Amino acid sequence: ADLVMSTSAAGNSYIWRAPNGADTTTASSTLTIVPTSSLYQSGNWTLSVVNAAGCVSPASIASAVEINSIPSTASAGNNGPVCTGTDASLSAGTVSGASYAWYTDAGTSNQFSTLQNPTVNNLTNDSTFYLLVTVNGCPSALDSTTVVVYPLTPSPSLPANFAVCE
Amino acid sequence: TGTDASLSAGTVSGASYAWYTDAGTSNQFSTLQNPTVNNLTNDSTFYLLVTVNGCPSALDSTTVVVYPLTPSPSLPANFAVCE
Numbered sequence: 001a002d003l004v005m006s007t008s009a010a011g012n013s014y015i016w017r018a019p020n021g022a023d024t025t026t027a028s029s030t031l032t033i034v035p036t037s038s039l040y041q042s043g044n045w046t047l048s049v050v051n052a053a054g055c056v057s058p059a060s061i062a063s064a065v066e067i068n069s070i071p072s073t074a075s076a077g078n079n080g081p082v083c084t085g086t087d088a089s090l091s092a093g094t095v096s097g098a099s100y101a102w103y104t105d106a107g108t109s110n111q112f113s114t115l116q117n118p119t120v121n122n123l124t125n126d127s128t129f130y131l132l133v134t135v136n137g138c139p140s141a142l143d144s145t146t147v148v149v150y151p152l153t154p155s156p157s158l159p160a161n162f163a164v165c166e
Numbered sequence: 167t168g169t170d171a172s173l174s175a176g177t178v179s180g181a182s183y184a185w186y187t188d189a190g191t192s193n194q195f196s197t198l199q200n201p202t203v204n205n206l207t208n209d210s211t212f213y214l215l216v217t218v219n220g221c222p223s224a225l226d227s228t229t230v231v232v233y234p235l236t237p238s239p240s241l242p243a244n245f246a247v248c249e
Contacts, residue, residue, distance in 0.1 A: 072182055075198040093198050096180065 003040055003065065006030040011049030019043030042067040071095065071140040076131045078147045088120045088147050092131055103130045123149050171203045171230050175214055186213045206232050
């Protein structure tokens with residue numbers, strides 16, 4: 001994600017100091033760092049400004065930036081084939097402390113559940129479900145699963161109505 | 167032959183697990199400690215990497231051996247008896 005830092009301070013030019021000493025400038029009160037850059041680094045950032053007389057302000061109190069990694073995905077699946085009309089359950093792998101979120105659509109707007117292994121009610125067809133796993137606020141890609149519904153059992157066949165003598 | 171199977175891996179301190187369908191670990195199979203395997207009809211093999219603090223630990227192949235098909239039992243040919 002882009003790293004965005006800004007001030008409200010007035011100045012003619014703004015001086016941005018990276019934790020590792022990298023030092024850049026801009027005319028704007030807002031600096032955006034695109035993550036290809038040598039400045040896309042975590043740690044304590046400081047700012048100082050320079051006015052029209054060429055005078056540089058004291059540096060600001062550092063603001064920490066915490067760049068989090070993107071977690072790996074959880075294994076995801078379900079209990080296996082389900083008889084048409086009955087209940088089923090989903091399954092997700094355990095990772096270190098993380099929240100789980102299941103969605104009813106690939107576009108994760110319709111929240112299904114927040115459980116590690118939620119159940120699914122009344123499957124009559126091959127509904128799919130989508131899993132996100134979030135650690136320290138960072139979601140881990142997305143994992144689709146399909147619960148396969150077995151075909152309906154055909155009726156057994158008996159002889160036609162008949163009669164016998166005593 | 168024809169049924170399901172499961173894989174197994176030892177527990178180590180916090181580590182991620184990754185199983186591959188090939189020695190060249192480009193085709194991700196699963197990320198579970200002990201994932202299942204569906205429909206084995208032959209001796210498929212699987213490959214395990216274990217990663218700690220970003221460092222993968224060599225590679226470990228396993229083979230799930232599939233038993234040979236049960237032969238059909240043999241009965242006498244069609245026959246008849248009197249009441």
